Write a protein that binds this ligand. Sequence first.
Ligand code: CL
Ligand code: ZN
Ligand code: ZN
Ligand code: ZN
Length: 121
Amino acid sequence: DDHYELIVDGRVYYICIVCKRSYVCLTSLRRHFNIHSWEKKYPCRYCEKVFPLAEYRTKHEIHHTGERRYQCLACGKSFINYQFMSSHIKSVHSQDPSGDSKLYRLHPCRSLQIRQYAYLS
DNA sequence: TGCTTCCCGCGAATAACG
DNA sequence: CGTTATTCGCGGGAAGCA
Ligand SMILES: [Cl-]
Ligand SMILES: [Zn+2]
Ligand SMILES: [Zn+2]
Ligand SMILES: [Zn+2]
């Protein structure tokens, strides 16, 4: 297979047979394991690059379109990802967007065709 | 040390299946 | 199709890099 199981305190962990990383969720081990096997490939559809996780490709492709989905609700400035948004809000507004802050809005993705969560509309 | 990308629990969206 | 099985978007802390 691709893993073995470890059980401490009645709680189950799934361990990657290759690098021994531990996962609470089997789906996470599977997602991770592609890094080792390259069974599935996620090539960028704008350049040569190829990724081992679907989400790594998606975040990369947003860099190509230049879409700015993260918007600061205190001043209206928008950002390409959470990290730049969070960094802005902490440094400029001295506030933490963690928890449920209501300090930012994540717009739906319109520059790419990805799965759309209803809660963003 | 400030960008930049990675990581993984969680669960909504959707593909697979019967 | 209903139903369950799979995918992968998301937060936000960690790790990587120059
Ligand atoms: Cl935009
Ligand atoms: Zn591994
Ligand atoms: Zn690319
Ligand atoms: Zn702002």
